[PDB]
Amino acid sequence: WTATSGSCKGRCFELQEVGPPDCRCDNLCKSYSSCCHDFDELCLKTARGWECTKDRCGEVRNEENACHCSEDCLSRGDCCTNYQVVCKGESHWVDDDCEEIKVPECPAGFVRPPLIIFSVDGFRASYMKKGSKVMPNIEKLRSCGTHAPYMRPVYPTKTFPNLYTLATGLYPESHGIVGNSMYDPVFDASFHLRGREKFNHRWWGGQPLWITATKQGVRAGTFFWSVSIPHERRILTILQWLSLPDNERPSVYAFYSEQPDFSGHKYGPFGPEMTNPLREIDKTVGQLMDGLKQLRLHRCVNVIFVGDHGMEDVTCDRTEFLSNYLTNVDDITLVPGTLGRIRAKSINNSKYDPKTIIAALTCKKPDQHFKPYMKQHLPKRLHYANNRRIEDIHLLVDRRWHVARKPLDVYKKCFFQGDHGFDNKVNSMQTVFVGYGPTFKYRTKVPPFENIELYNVMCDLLGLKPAPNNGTHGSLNHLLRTNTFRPTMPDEVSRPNYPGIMYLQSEFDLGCTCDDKVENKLEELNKRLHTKGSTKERHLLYGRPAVLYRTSYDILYHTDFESGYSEIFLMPLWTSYTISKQAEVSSIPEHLTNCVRPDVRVSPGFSQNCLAYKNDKQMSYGFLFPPYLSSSPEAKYDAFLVTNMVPMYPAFKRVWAYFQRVLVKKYASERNGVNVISGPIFDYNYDGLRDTEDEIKQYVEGSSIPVPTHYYSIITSCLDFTQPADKCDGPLSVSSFILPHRPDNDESCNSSEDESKWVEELMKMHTARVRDIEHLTGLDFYRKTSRSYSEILTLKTYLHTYESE
Ligand SMILES: *[C@@H]1O[C@H](CO)[C@@H](O[C@@H]2O[C@H](CO)[C@@H](O[C@@H]3O[C@H](CO[C@H]4O[C@H](CO)[C@@H](O)[C@H](O[C@H]5O[C@H](CO)[C@@H](O)[C@H](O)[C@@H]5O[C@H]5O[C@H](CO)[C@@H](O)[C@H](O)[C@@H]5O)[C@@H]4O)[C@@H](O)[C@H](O[C@H]4O[C@H](CO)[C@@H](O)[C@H](O)[C@@H]4O[C@H]4O[C@H](CO)[C@@H](O)[C@H](O)[C@@H]4O)[C@@H]3O)[C@H](O)[C@H]2NC(C)=O)[C@H](O)[C@H]1NC(C)=O
Ligand SMILES: CNC(=O)CCn1cc(CNCc2ccc(Br)cc2)c2ccccc21
Ligand SMILES: [Ca+2]
Ligand code: NA
Ligand code: NA
Ligand SMILES: [Zn+2]
């Protein structure tokens, strides 16, 4: 119930929300059907439109007007935004040459530069160049301020997941808004774009920026605008709030536009109908900047122009139907479109088996335009699994396509020509970031970055302590003139042991064998030096990784590689080695095919054994440092140490062997040497965080050897590739992966072909940030470089995406 008989007199766009049944006058009252009877009359005035004209200049004030051109309008804070241009001979902001904003130039009584976030739905990154001729205000912001060539959204690349990620710094799996449509089986409730359930606070996790601000005594504008409020009135409302007395005036504001998304769905991303919505958004930006210039705030406010996701060409005819695959299509519920999510239609159906559904959807048609996954098997970079609202079965849909349950869903719902939602590395999904103002840099291009990083920056811009989030605070310091956040490196928690030779060969009863009983004072001291770390500077280029949790581990040195060997998990946590451009690849010699050698530095009780592998008919083993890249026949024996062995399914060994034998040398050739750090990951509860021992669900049969869920590698070289990776004076370049450790290659439909036709494709799909590996391992990399720590944080957030220009 709402008692709509109250009045909005003196309350238009009030900031504090009044509770039912009292009627409302805030910018969301329309959405709740709760506005006072006189809200339209008083708060949504439209008389005479949005612009001053010559004949209106100096007019007697008429309070009916949408905005004013009377001499008193500046003091009232309600001039039309073009008032000073039309009436006082001033220039539009866009026509002024840009001039560096070295210091905030704020009116008296301003305690900090305000922040205005100007958010645009469906604003594809390439619009900044392709539309630049029709967006002069936006082009001025971009060229004069700080901009990225694009900003990477979160998956799914839908509106509500992304706008809430922007507001909280969190992945959708953590903030809870995992789609525009959701079912929560604990609540037994459904969230939809249409209707009232979406207003219930129980859906919305984390702590969005407006709450962070309020909790720390920084006043916020209300960020949400009912759709019927015209953009011109949104801009005027912001400018009016900026005229409030100091103690009442917010410090942070948000504007939102439903365009260009609205038109992009109808016309496609580059439909000729798209030029007008881009012109109109630019015009709104110009209104805001002119309005700020009127208030003498245009060199005081920090403005962020930011999108949620891009837009791809998608038409009704490019729809895959589950009814062409499943015998039992009426037994499932599908959330459809540019991603698929599948669950049982009935929880009383005991005949429901996700395994048979996945299998029926796997590589069944030559050109199949989606791929099914159990959510834990999705690329770890998507961070899209750890939430009860994410169905166990996910379909990753190819760009330009939809999935639907049956054909009747698509014509009893072609209209549309654009959509979004796909994998967040897809070029058409990328969106925009520009920051302009005193706290941003001047005429500065920054590399692409992820939207999860912005909350921390917005907090920095407002002097707020961010709530715990998934950004890496400091990684965007290079966007900022001032207000940088200068983190300290985390403290190492576990110090390594450095074991010497402590065990005799006969103490080991591991069931292993090796043809190494082949026999010099010259070379003997030299090999002792290698075991004490004489080559470590060559192979550990950025310091040893720090272990940020409590555990027992040993540093093991060798001619060709260094490792941190876990006595708890019976295998290395990391293995580090450098491969120069000149390195040669060799075979595993015949006599060494099945060689595994006890490590006399590590007790039998803290070693793996070969017998467990012999007896486990599903599980084989691989090596972290590759025997193929040994520096000499003699050094190759180190690569067969039991302390370099890790459990690998035979199907995964196909992947791993090709990476080690072919791809590492390829990368060294291309990048002028590479440093590689490889190791296992255990994430059985798919939370993106390192498992403890008691979370491990699978072991090599009969043994205490834990089976990794993934294998990672971090591949580092010099950004200036004229310098070799091991003699790099400046910034680094990295690419990494987190490969799923799976007993089949069903993910790769072409896996019957030579690895040259499918392995690198798999690896590209499972590309990762170093930060992703840090979360999954409790390790901290790049501890000892010549580089500034914030530069290293940026490097750790880098994702190599493998998309074209
Ligand atoms: C991305 O950044 C985020 C933010 O930093 C990281 O997420 C954090 O990770 C922590 C570990 O997973 C997690 O810490 C837990 O907090 C529990 C209390 O949580 C509540 O309070 C906080 C603070 O206000 C709040 O934010 C939480 O919000 C979650 O839950 C609500 C629903 O109530 C959602 O609306 C909201 O979206 C959010 O959901 C997300 O997180 C939860 C987990 O909290 C997931 O289940 C969801 O799927 C979703 O992803 C909560 O309101 C606290 O109880 C935990 O403590 C347990 O474990 C510790 C180990 O240290 C142990 O000491 C305790 O014994 C305890 O165990 C007991 O409970 C067990 C479970 O019932 C039981 O099995 C045991 O036997 C014990 O009884 C724990 O400390 C933190 O909540 C989240 N925060 C957020 C916002 O998500 C995230 O990891 C980053 N991601 C990456 C990849 O780095
Ligand atoms: C038809 N209208 C809609 O669909 C409203 C959708 N919508 C608008 C906002 C808030 N405004 C945009 C915004 C978001 C973050 C920041 Br930081 C700054 C501005 C929002 C936040 C979460 C989820 C959905 C959201
Ligand atoms: Ca985990
Ligand atoms: Na085996
Ligand atoms: Na296959
Ligand atoms: Zn859309």
Strands 620-623 and 645-648: antiparallel
* Distance of CA 681 from the midpoint of ligand 3 (Å): 9
* Distance of CA 459 from the midpoint of ligand 2 (Å): 18
Which of 223, 263, 303 most suits a substitution to test ligand 2, by most atoms within 8 Å of the C-beta? Answer: 223
Q: Closest-lying ligand to the alpha carbon of 118? A: 2
What secondary structure letter does DSSP report for 620? E
Which of 157, 256, 469 most suits a substitution to test ligand 2, by most atoms within 8 Å of the C-beta? Answer: 256
Rounded Cα distance, 410 and 405, in Å: 9
Residue 246 labeled ligand binder: no
Rounded Cα distance, 385 and 257, in Å: 30
Tell me how many degrees the CA angle 10-12-14 measures, rounded to the nearest 5.
Answer: 95
Give the 3-state secondary structure of residue 694: helix
- Nearest ligand 1 atom to the CA of 173 is 50
| Closest C-alpha residue for ligand 2 atom 22 | 164
Residue 308 labeled ligand binder: yes
Q: Residues with Cβ within 6 A of ligand 2?
A: 117, 119, 160, 163-164, 166-167, 209, 223-224, 227, 254, 256, 258
Residue 37 labeled ligand binder: no
Strand order in the sheet with 339-344: 332-335, 339-344, 393-397, 370-374
Residue 689 labeled ligand binder: yes
Rg (CA), the chain: 30
Q: Which tokens sit at 205? A: 């996790």
Q: Which tokens sit at 193? A: 């774009």
Q: For residue 43, give the H/E element and its range.
A: helix 39-43
* Distance of CA 126 from the midpoint of ligand 2 (Å): 22
* Distance of CA 368 from the midpoint of ligand 5 (Å): 13
Rounded Cα distance, 428 and 767, in Å: 18
Q: Residues with Cβ within 6 A of ligand 1?
A: 170-171, 173-176, 205-206, 383, 386-388, 468-470, 687-689, 775
- Nearest ligand 1 atom to the CA of 387 is 48
Of 177, 208, 400, 180, residue with least CA distance to 310 = 400
Q: Closest-lying ligand to the alpha carbon of 386? A: 1
Work out the number of other CB atoms within 10 angstroms of the CB of residue 579: 27
| Closest C-alpha residue for ligand 1 atom 40 | 174
Q: Closest-lying ligand to the alpha carbon of 200? A: 1
Residue 460 labeled ligand binder: no
| Closest C-alpha residue for ligand 1 atom 31 | 205
Tell me how many degrees the CA angle 803-804-805 measures, rounded to the nearest 5.
Answer: 125
Rounded Cα distance, 230 and 73, in Å: 21
Q: Closest-lying ligand to the alpha carbon of 511? A: 4
DSSP 312-328: EE--TTSEEEGGGT-TT
- Nearest ligand 2 atom to the CA of 458 is 17
Rounded Cα distance, 501 and 430, in Å: 54
* Distance of CA 750 from the midpoint of ligand 5 (Å): 6
Rounded Cα distance, 504 and 327, in Å: 62
| Closest C-alpha residue for ligand 2 atom 2 | 227
DSSP 46-59: -BT-S---GGGTTP
Kindly list the distances between the CA atom of residue 647 and the CA atoms of 510, 571, 589, 619, in Å, as whole numbers in the listed order: 15, 9, 21, 7
* Distance of CA 203 from the midpoint of ligand 1 (Å): 15
Residue 638 labeled ligand binder: no
Q: Which residues pair with 648 in a beta bridge?
A: 620
Contact (Cβ atoms closer than 8 angstroms) between residue 356 and residue 393: no
* Distance of CA 795 from the midpoint of ligand 1 (Å): 28
Residue 27 labeled ligand binder: no
Q: Closest-lying ligand to the alpha carbon of 684? A: 3
CATH of 505-797, one of 3.40.50.880, 3.40.570.10, 3.40.50.2300, 3.40.50.300: 3.40.570.10
Q: For residue 264, give the H/E element and its range.
A: helix 261-267
Ranges assigned E (strand) in 443-587: 444-445, 449-450, 546-547, 553-557, 562-566, 571-579
Residue of 159, 222, 237, 472 marked catalytic:
159
Residue 265 labeled ligand binder: yes
Alpha helices in 6-148 (DSSP H): 39-43, 73-76, 83-88, 127-130, 136-144
Of 191, 173, 158, residue with least CA distance to 397 = 158
* Distance of CA 20 from the midpoint of ligand 2 (Å): 23
The technique is X-ray
- Nearest ligand 1 atom to the CA of 687 is 93
Q: For residue 260, give the H/E element and its range.
A: strand 252-260
Q: Spell 765-783 as b/e; 16+ CB within 10 A means b.
A: bbbbbbbbbbbbbbbbbbb
2 a catalytic residue: no
Q: Which class for 709: exposed (0-12), middle (13-18), buried (19 or more C-beta within 10 A)? A: buried
Rounded Cα distance, 448 and 55, in Å: 48
Whether the ω angle into residue 626 lies within 30 degrees of 0, i.e. cis, is no
Give the 3-state secondary structure of residue 141: helix
Rounded Cα distance, 249 and 243, in Å: 7
Tell me how many degrees the CA angle 733-737-739 measures, rounded to the nearest 5.
Answer: 170
Which of 155, 164, 174 most suits a substitution to test ligand 1, by most atoms within 8 Å of the C-beta? Answer: 174
Contact (Cβ atoms closer than 8 angstroms) between residue 517 and residue 530: no
Contact (Cβ atoms closer than 8 angstroms) between residue 302 and residue 437: yes
Backbone angles phi, psi at 320, to 5 degrees: -85, 140
Q: Which tokens sit at 696? A: 């491990």
Of 574, 570, 583, 452, residue with least CA distance to 155 = 452
Which of 28, 163, 231, 234 most suits a substitution to test ligand 2, by most atoms within 8 Å of the C-beta? Answer: 163
789 torsion bin: left (phi>0), alpha (psi -120 to 50), beta (else): alpha
Strand order in the sheet with 433-436: 252-260, 115-121, 302-307, 433-436, 146-147, 444-445
Strands 319-321 and 402-404: parallel
Rounded Cα distance, 586 and 578, in Å: 16
Q: Which tokens sit at 734? A: 């990295």
Alpha carbon of residue 324 to chain centroid: 34
Contact (Cβ atoms closer than 8 angstroms) between residue 544 and residue 496: yes
Q: Determine the number of helices (DSSP H) and then strands (DSSP E) in the chain.
A: 23, 29
| Closest C-alpha residue for ligand 1 atom 47 | 387
Rounded Cα distance, 441 and 433, in Å: 13
Q: Which residues hold their Cβ within 5 A of ligand 6, which is an ion?
A: 261
Of 45, 21, 24, residue with least CA distance to 36 = 24
Handedness of CA 750, 751, 753, 754 (dihedral sign): positive
Rounded Cα distance, 530 and 355, in Å: 50
Work out the number of other CB atoms within 10 angstroms of the CB of residue 722: 7
Kindly list the distances between the CA atom of residue 22 and the CA atoms of 3, 36, 39, in Å, as whole numbers in the listed order: 6, 8, 13
Task: Specify the residue for token string 């709760």.
Answer: 34
